[PDB]
A paper describes a structure:
To gain insight into the molecular mechanisms by which C. difficile spores sense germinant, we solved the crystal structure of C. difficile CspC to 1.55 Å resolution. Determination of the crystal structure of the C. difficile CspC pseudoprotease revealed that it shares a conserved three domain architecture with the C. perfringens CspB protease, consisting of an N-terminal prodomain, subtilase domain, and jelly roll domain. Despite this shared secondary structure, C. difficile CspC does not autoprocess its prodomain due to substitutions in its catalytic triad. In addition, CspC’s prodomain is more closely associated with the subtilase and jelly roll domains due to a clamping loop shown in the surface representation. Interestingly, the degenerate site residues of CspC’s pseudotriad share the same orientation as the catalytic triad of CspB and other subtilisin-like serine proteases. Surprisingly, even with the extensive interactions between the different sub-domains of CspC, residues in both the jelly roll domain and prodomain have higher B-factors than nearby residues in the subtilase domain.
The major nosocomial pathogen Clostridioides difficile depends on spore germination to initiate infection. Interestingly, C. difficile’s germinant sensing mechanism differs markedly from other spore-forming bacteria, since it uses bile acids to induce germination and lacks the transmembrane germinant receptors conserved in almost all spore-forming organisms. Instead, C. difficile is thought to use CspC, a soluble pseudoprotease, to sense these unique bile acid germinants. While C. difficile strains encode homologs of all three Csp proteins, only CspB has an intact Asp, His, and Ser catalytic triad, since CspA and CspC carry mutations in two of the catalytic residues that render them pseudoproteases.
Residue numbers in the entry: 2 to 88, 93 to 455, 458 to 505, 509 to 555, 560 to 565
Amino acid sequence: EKSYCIIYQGDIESALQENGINRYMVLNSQLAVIYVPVDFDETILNNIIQVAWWEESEPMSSLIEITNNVNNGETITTAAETDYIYEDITGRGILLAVIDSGIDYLHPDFINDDGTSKVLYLWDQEANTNPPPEGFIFGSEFTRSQLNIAINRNDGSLSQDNIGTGTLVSGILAGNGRINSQYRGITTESDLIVVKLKSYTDTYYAGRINYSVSDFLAAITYVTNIARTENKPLIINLTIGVKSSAVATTSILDTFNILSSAGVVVVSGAGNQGNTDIHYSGRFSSVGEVQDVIIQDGDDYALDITLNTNGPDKVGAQIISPSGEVSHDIRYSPDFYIYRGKFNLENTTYAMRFIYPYITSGKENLEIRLRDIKPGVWILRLTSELIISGEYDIYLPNKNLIAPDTRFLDPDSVATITMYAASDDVITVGTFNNKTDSMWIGSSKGPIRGIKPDIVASGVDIISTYKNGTYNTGTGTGVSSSIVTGVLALLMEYLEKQPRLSLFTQVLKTYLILGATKLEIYTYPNVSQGYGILNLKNTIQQIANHHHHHH
């Protein structure tokens, strides 16, 4: 099953059904997702008048690395600096969304003294034992009442977290320290809304697991539906991400009107591509110039390469195999042609085509798909056709989806933000390393053209709940974003106590930036640290007491 995101106008449901597209979900007034067989002819979508835009759903991967280092780890209390509060603010009345690998809801650290679950709602997109949530076409929805019975019966079968990152995230936000009190999370009275996303294996490299944009967008619809029903503020914590990009405009998440409402806040990790060499930056100085971009491939099965030209610049492209066989030398043409072929010695096939993603507003990007790729040096030969600045960017998939040795020969760590964290409509969090008193080497960096991340937070070897009633440690920007999510829940309750219609992302981001710690002699803001390090105590003092970072 592949899937597509669709921007529609009119009666899209009738139109899809008339075209034999029977598996779909309408997610908001503009956005639908469809699920179709592998043999599906995507050109169909151009001849459905109710379709305005369409894009194949791309892989997403975790922003957390599990590091098995509890003995030298840092507690959540230390990372979030929450002794200043707890040593009447608990996160009461705030909903927190975890969209990830699920949750081990039988972990004692998610069970209250009276035996009830800290999870309010759980949608397991893979399960088939309860009906899906209303308006969705797969998985099983569970409520706290059901989880409470499951806890009483020690029934862990409703939904399992087989990876552990969702459990790690949930513990940062809300673990109660039942097994080890030192390891408790940030909030005590916030409710969790958990979605376990459908998973896929071996997309590029054997043994690696990814998620898919379409399923993620459906999860966004579900958790915001719940927030609307419960009429409570909601923080959505993005601990997974698509591939990195240099674009800084809004994403397809901007189709959700609810994400522009008061009391609905999106926090994302910045990305974990700061040192993974999955980004190439280049610049043409003239038209007709040829530049060769060197890619080393490890033992990948497949690879997707995205080229973006950041402006009106037009660039042609050709793929060259380690043995010297070449692909079509493609140029801009006003058609949807997919150029295909085979590198005979390598037995590798390619598909190259221009893509029109929603985020670039009609500007084409170049997509190159290599299948059955073999190890060695691959060359992307680029020819400029029209330039103003001449600048361009190329991205490989996130490193945790591809072979360890797959990389650009000449990488650029700048402009490695994961794409959904690029927009100013999200609070974007990078990872500080308290052990080295510096940024984590893996933390993605903002672009120079255009500031991300907004702030950073401790996120190296953080101890949290893990599967099967254990503790483990995690590192990365999904850890840091979880720290900020939990602290923001405390800040939102503090603001409400001493109007909720004013708790917009922009307001909360301003307070986080005003309270952030700036280390001596560095220049701020910068594309590594943003405006500085999260500081709960100083942010409260700012809330209590021209000061805007753009004024």
